[PDB]
Design a protein around this ligand. Structure first.
Ligand SMILES: C[C@H](C[C@@H](C[C@H](C[C@@H](C[C@@H](CCN1CCCC1=O)N1CCCC1=O)N1CCCC1=O)N1CCCC1=O)N1CCCC1=O)N1CCCC1=O
Ligand SMILES: C[C@H](C[C@@H](C[C@H](C[C@@H](C[C@@H](CCN1CCCC1=O)N1CCCC1=O)N1CCCC1=O)N1CCCC1=O)N1CCCC1=O)N1CCCC1=O
Ligand SMILES: C[C@H](C[C@@H](C[C@H](C[C@@H](C[C@@H](CCN1CCCC1=O)N1CCCC1=O)N1CCCC1=O)N1CCCC1=O)N1CCCC1=O)N1CCCC1=O
Ligand SMILES: C[C@H](C[C@@H](C[C@H](C[C@@H](C[C@@H](CCN1CCCC1=O)N1CCCC1=O)N1CCCC1=O)N1CCCC1=O)N1CCCC1=O)N1CCCC1=O
Ligand SMILES: C[C@H](C[C@@H](C[C@H](C[C@@H](C[C@@H](CCN1CCCC1=O)N1CCCC1=O)N1CCCC1=O)N1CCCC1=O)N1CCCC1=O)N1CCCC1=O
Ligand SMILES: C[C@H](C[C@@H](C[C@H](C[C@@H](C[C@@H](CCN1CCCC1=O)N1CCCC1=O)N1CCCC1=O)N1CCCC1=O)N1CCCC1=O)N1CCCC1=O
Ligand SMILES: O=C1c2c(O)c(=O)ccn2N([C@@H]2c3ccccc3SCc3c2ccc(F)c3F)[C@@H]2COCCN12
Ligand SMILES: O=C1c2c(O)c(=O)ccn2N([C@@H]2c3ccccc3SCc3c2ccc(F)c3F)[C@@H]2COCCN12
Ligand SMILES: O=C1c2c(O)c(=O)ccn2N([C@@H]2c3ccccc3SCc3c2ccc(F)c3F)[C@@H]2COCCN12
Ligand SMILES: O=C1c2c(O)c(=O)ccn2N([C@@H]2c3ccccc3SCc3c2ccc(F)c3F)[C@@H]2COCCN12
Ligand SMILES: O=C1c2c(O)c(=O)ccn2N([C@@H]2c3ccccc3SCc3c2ccc(F)c3F)[C@@H]2COCCN12
Ligand SMILES: O=C1c2c(O)c(=O)ccn2N([C@@H]2c3ccccc3SCc3c2ccc(F)c3F)[C@@H]2COCCN12
Ligand SMILES: O=C1c2c(O)c(=O)ccn2N([C@@H]2c3ccccc3SCc3c2ccc(F)c3F)[C@@H]2COCCN12
Ligand SMILES: O=C1c2c(O)c(=O)ccn2N([C@@H]2c3ccccc3SCc3c2ccc(F)c3F)[C@@H]2COCCN12
Ligand SMILES: [Mn+2]
Ligand SMILES: [Mn+2]
Ligand SMILES: [Mn+2]
Ligand SMILES: [Mn+2]
Ligand SMILES: [Mn+2]
Ligand SMILES: [Mn+2]
Ligand SMILES: [Mn+2]
Ligand SMILES: [Mn+2]
Ligand SMILES: [Mn+2]
Ligand SMILES: [Mn+2]
Ligand SMILES: [Mn+2]
Ligand SMILES: [Mn+2]
Ligand SMILES: [Mn+2]
Ligand SMILES: [Mn+2]
Ligand SMILES: [Mn+2]
Ligand SMILES: [Mn+2]
Lengths: 181, 181, 181, 181, 181, 181, 181, 181
């Protein structure tokens, strides 16, 4: 047994569906949520942001790729590629935008948004995949200064992120989380 | 007992409400889902596309004729005809469009959309009934190049169709399904 | 016991919430649904039309007065009058339109819409109350040729009304219902 | 035991979620709903108005601060301030408007709206916090004559307030409630 | 409007299903729950006791006659009589005991149980109908000193009755209720 | 369209799960509930009696064979036979009794129970299958005078049957139902 | 903000209904669950044990006094006393046993059961109130060596208590909890 | 992708809760349900049998150890051992019997029950752990000829097992499943 304070916080911070999907994702890659508790908190956070993000558009606008098992995520990507003609990305994206006709990679970072976007931009070769970074201090950075959603939908995310930061802080979990990325 | 791999795939591929409605439809016409398993898969697919399609418009836009028992489908058609003045079609359509004021026949084909539309166009005498064909490779073809719904709503359908194709393929069921139309 | 075929049809034709509200309305006025079965069918129909009607606008557009007990319906009317300055009507209306700022009296008739509107127009003294008649043959007639809702929302109602007519007919209940108004 | 007629009216007037949230709020400040029954009725009313108010905008428009425990309300305020740059208010507001980028203090008064707005305006130092007063007679008063929501959304609130007034009156509870502010 | 304190207490004292069934019962006999508020409280109480009583036996032991519309209550009585050979009672009973093979009339009184049993015993001619009286002070009296249920099941009822008495008292409603029988 | 009064009565008499299972059973054998309305009423009745019957024993006592598709009913029979050693019956039974270790054929008749039991006894060759007949007048007849369940569980069934008889009668449907067996 | 590891553990250890009832109980006595976190854990534990305990008897055996607001707990006690003749206890008990006709005070201790029973026995003057102590190491001690429930029902409680002990230990919360009584 | 016919059968054969728990169990041990499809079918079967088994006793009789994550299963075992004094087993058991005070290891085999019991008996050192083997042909074998449950509860399991065998057979999956143990 590990008995982590972070694990208990994550289960009280996030809704059960988010917790369960992150748990399953971590296991698919051979990570244990009871040990890699910072990663447990990060994947739950990233998932909520993706779900909040997809809720921001018009109905039917987004295809959610994140939150699926590896095989099924790539299946939906293939159907999207084979029906829209977009090139198949080399790395799994997070969403697909049926309005702008491009995949979206979403990032959540405890560092400056500019340095995380650099990393993801270099990692992904598919220059077509749109990148959108959010930070725990309320900054965001998006490819071509195109932020996809309107201001209010993005502001919700930023507010939620800062609330998770505080909840972590009041429990003395933030410092360990911050210096873990 | 038949014990079909396709039957089990259909029950895991489609949601129970779709499965049940297709089962009932097939029986109304004296077909057994446990034997005519390709038809089982086709009617479930066609139904989902119709439901996805009707979800694409503004609220109240569409009347769903598909997914009802024969007698009740013709009842709703009669009320539609007797209240809008449109001519009564000779063959049951799939939807009615209260915005464009016309019935819609929806088709899903494993062949080239152009050859399936030809068949349906000649079968139906009511030239007023709007035709919309979708293919399992992402093509679509609609009467008068009028596609009724906006791009994103149609792209969802095309993506879903290609996902069913893949799911069938990974189980070695696609070839039998394709060469069955 | 009465054991009416119409009573059983009404309970299978309408959803339980509509049936229950009409039953309660009829009793409040000292009418028995098991005897006055035509009135049972009429009040259920009128209620569904009112609910369909109120679903036709933008969110928050309509206040539903029908489907409440007498005392509470007049309470909501008073609050509406005392907050919008509109004159208090002499007879209970069916809805209030927050967009057009007027009460709506809704009518459903088995006769020509023009003769039913005449009756309601003369009955109500409050010339401000907007009148909207629907018929079982798909006609409608509204004060000042102002039909409040857009075409599709009204077409749904007309289709539903003609479907109830048919359902009644196939059971040989229509003739008795028609020649009862 | 107190056995208040007002307490029983409040539990039949408001929905359980509203009652429960007000009960919890009152206790957090060391007030007993079974004794301070006018305050019980007021906080339930204020809460419903806030929830009705937040339902009036576009989706994602408002952040609801009211209806949370003290510590969590200030947490969401901090995240809002730390992500939008708005100054942190000295007193807890009721909502945040992501469209207009300002906090909203909502007031419900049994006096003239003009005298209650004066009080709240002087109490709060943060001149940025938008003030919106509703009265039990259907008047409203908002900072800069900017009423945030469109007419119909505000008219619903005014109607609901006058309905609570009547419900109180028919039980001879209004006079005590009015002369308690 | 009547605006009764008793009416509001009844809706907070009893569960909605009990309230609704009593309301419907009272209307079937041309009584208004908003005026005859003592009768409103009495019929709700009597109903709860009957339901508690029927929950006291083994599964399938009791047929609940109370809580049905007049016509259906007499229908179930007829089926019981026509299948068990028991004589048809002249007045509607409250339950039927499939173990002891007899109808049960249940009484709840604010007077001495002995004087209420006398009344019911003389009212009913069918000496076969078993009588069981409960009082608001915890006394009970049953035909032939046969109390049907075991002690604990009857003690629950007595406890619940005294709790309703107290709830009424703390609101100064008991005296009016007591001196109303 | 047929528009039967019996069809509407059946849908108001029986619970939706019973109606649906009977509908499906009738179709599996190529019968239409909208035409063979007496058979519709009979199969619903028989099903309810079987479900009531299986609810009469101790938990786990009965295996319900009725209410399944043909293929699955015979599957459960085979597992029962292949695990208890009982001989496989030639005709589908209604239940299996794990306490008495025998299949049960349940019958509901509008004639004298003695003449219906004769028919079923001669039809079935498996003398091991226990027979239990119920009548619409409250009589019952069981193999070897062994009635499996205790008195109260059987009395419920008899009461329910006579209630269906009355409900049919008050609608002038009984005579046609009776003279149809 | 306090941000306690114990608080988060309690919300993941106990079911929401238990957490909520304990939170409300603590506030009624002017204790904050966010600060007095050991008491938060203790009251949740005690509540679960009481609910498990009451689930151990026959149906209707126990009246649950714990888990109610102070005023209502004493109301049910009064009805119990005024209907069974038992003397009214000076301190709120946890249950009432309708079979043995006595109140039960339940205790959960981190010390030797014998020393906690001594304390409760001296605190309560009503020698009639039955005492039942459980320990976190699986010991129990009951008045007159009468343990009310059968062995299996008590063993469940003991197992659950030791599981909470372990869950606390694996998080390094046990030592602080133990040395807090 | 694997696309197994067995995988699809398992998801249609077992209820979602059973499927999900087995999936999670298999992953905890580094097995993939999409590849080890026979093991997928076996663990689902074993789980259902355990749940059926635990449903066979009196309420509170059994503690279910199977169907939990490794760490929590051993936690409940420790609490059971530390509260009943039973020796801690070396290998995780399936249940604990509070009536007979012993752990139960449940086995399901496609071979002769006698050879599987031999294996489990030698594997486990704790001679105290009670062993109960079920076969897919309806045989069972239990330690000391003590079968814990009464006949009917065990017969249900045997019937269910043979039904899974048939369902597998009709799909030509049985032979591969049988020759896999
Ligand atoms: C309602 C949701 C809305 C949304 C979640 C959203 C999409 C999820 C779950 C659907 N799934 C789960 C696995 C199978 C599948 O189809 N998807 C879709 C693709 C894969 C995935 O994981 N949907 C839609 C149906 C139910 C559901 O959850 N959002 C947005 C905010 C957070 C959140 O959850 N809401 C609203 C708030 C709470 C909640 O849950
Ligand atoms: C969802 C509904 C939508 C609508 C009914 C509507 C309003 C009814 C019920 C609310 N009530 C009942 C008594 C107390 C109260 O507040 N109102 C409001 C004023 C008085 C009244 O009677 N609402 C909203 C909440 C639930 C509900 O029913 N519609 C429109 C179509 C037919 C229908 O019913 N839908 C959608 C379809 C099925 C259904 O029921
Ligand atoms: C669960 C109940 C148990 C019981 C009520 C009981 C019987 C009622 C309702 C069933 N009805 C309502 C009209 C149509 C019909 O069949 N009957 C039966 C005959 C006529 C009648 O009115 N049943 C059984 C099904 C649901 C239900 O309510 N009890 C006993 C205690 C108080 C109470 O309500 N419980 C448990 C507690 C809360 C509750 O409601
Ligand atoms: C609760 C039920 C109890 C019982 C019905 C019973 C068994 C049915 C349905 C289960 N099914 C349906 C198809 C798949 C499957 O497993 N079975 C089992 C074998 C085949 C069949 O058809 N069960 C148990 C689970 C839910 C259910 O319905 N009873 C007895 C009285 C009438 C009735 O329905 N109750 C209680 C009252 C209302 C109701 O429905
Ligand atoms: C089902 C329960 C069984 C039981 C809880 C039990 C009694 C509670 C809640 C009822 N309430 C809450 C406040 C108003 C009221 O009447 N009571 C009764 C007196 C006061 C109180 O608080 N009941 C019965 C109805 C629902 C409920 O919770 N148990 C026993 C185990 C733990 C637990 O909770 N179960 C089963 C497991 C999960 C659960 O909750
Ligand atoms: C109702 C069930 C009865 C039973 C399952 C049983 C126990 C399971 C689930 C409870 N869980 C899941 C994880 C957390 C937790 O506490 N347990 C308990 C220990 C670990 C575990 O896994 N319970 C009880 C509560 C709900 C539930 O499922 N049975 C017996 C037959 C098959 C089955 O599932 N029934 C009845 C039929 C369908 C169903 O599911
Ligand atoms: O989708 C992602 C993913 C992102 O989309 C992302 O933005 C950042 C990081 N990711 N990774 C996520 C992840 C997601 C969110 C926060 C941290 C991590 S850290 C690695 C990891 C992930 C999932 C499970 C797991 F066990 C991991 F170790 C992996 C990269 O491989 C494709 C899926 N994926
Ligand atoms: O509505 C349709 C229908 C279509 O709308 C359609 O587009 C293609 C094909 N259809 N047919 C559907 C159907 C639907 C979808 C896929 C395949 C089939 S193949 C024949 C068949 C259908 C339904 C039940 C059944 F038993 C059948 F044999 C029948 C044609 O008679 C009117 C209803 N209908
Ligand atoms: O609101 C209506 C109402 C209408 O709004 C309406 O359009 C036509 C007719 N109405 N009446 C409805 C009614 C509604 C729909 C169809 C038929 C009837 S017929 C009389 C009656 C009604 C309700 C209960 C009852 F027992 C009745 F006898 C009464 C007129 O008194 C105010 C309420 N009300
Ligand atoms: O948010 C409010 C609040 C308002 O927003 C408001 O508009 C008027 C009045 N308020 N107060 C509310 C309140 C809200 C609605 C109606 C009356 C009261 S009267 C004092 C009181 C409140 C909450 C609990 C409690 F026990 C109280 F005594 C307190 C002021 O401290 C911050 C929270 N709050
Ligand atoms: O069943 C009862 C009934 C009893 O069973 C009973 O015990 C006492 C009294 N009853 N009556 C109940 C009733 C039940 C409980 C408490 C008070 C009353 S007072 C009259 C009344 C009743 C129902 C509706 C109504 F409008 C009434 F005026 C009527 C007597 O006519 C048959 C039904 N019924
Ligand atoms: O199980 C029964 C069955 C009985 O168990 C029974 O007792 C009487 C009669 N049965 N039959 C039932 C049935 C059941 C209840 C009332 C009438 C009927 S009449 C024929 C029929 C049945 C089912 C569907 C259908 F379309 C039918 F025409 C058929 C006999 O073939 C095996 C299944 N079955
Ligand atoms: O019922 C109990 C109670 C017990 O029944 C008990 O066994 C031990 C202790 N109790 N007390 C419980 C309690 C219950 C369980 C564990 C610790 C505590 S510690 C004090 C406290 C309690 C409740 C709220 C609160 F804020 C408290 F400070 C109070 C004693 O006043 C009557 C109610 N009550
Ligand atoms: O509990 C069991 C278990 C049994 O109880 C059992 O009876 C037979 C076999 N078991 N094993 C089960 C299992 C259960 C049912 C059918 C086959 C298997 S095969 C190995 C395996 C199991 C679980 C997950 C997994 F990935 C596995 F490879 C493992 C042995 O390690 C402790 C848990 N466990
Ligand atoms: Mn991703
Ligand atoms: Mn990402
Ligand atoms: Mn069609
Ligand atoms: Mn089509
Ligand atoms: Mn009206
Ligand atoms: Mn009208
Ligand atoms: Mn506020
Ligand atoms: Mn405010
Ligand atoms: Mn009665
Ligand atoms: Mn009575
Ligand atoms: Mn049968
Ligand atoms: Mn039969
Ligand atoms: Mn206590
Ligand atoms: Mn205690
Ligand atoms: Mn195991
Ligand atoms: Mn095992």
């Amino acid at each position: 047994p590990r008995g982590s304070h972070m694990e208990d916080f994550v289960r009280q911070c996030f809704n059960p569906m988010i917790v369960e999907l992150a748990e399953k994702a971590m296991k698919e890659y051979g990570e244990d949520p009871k040990i890699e508790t910072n990663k447990f908190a990060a994947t739950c956070t990233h998932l909520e942001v993706c779900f909040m993000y997809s809720d921001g558009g018009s109905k039917h606008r987004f295809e959610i790729i994140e939150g699926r098992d590896r095989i099924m995520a790539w299946t939906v990507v293939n159907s999207i590629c084979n029906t829209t003609g977009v090139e198949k990305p080399k790395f799994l994206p997070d969403l697909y935008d049926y309005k702008e006709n491009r995949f979206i990679e979403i990032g959540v970072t405890r560092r400056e948004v500019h340095i995380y976007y650099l990393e993801k931009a270099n990692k992904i070769k598919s220059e077509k995949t749109h990148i959108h970074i959010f930070s725990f201090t309320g900054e965001e950075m998006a490819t071509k200064a195109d932020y996809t959603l309107d201001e209010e939908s993005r502001a919700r995310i930023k507010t939620r992120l800062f609330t998770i930061r505080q909840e972590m802080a009041s429990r003395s979990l933030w410092d360990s989380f911050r210096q873990s990325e």
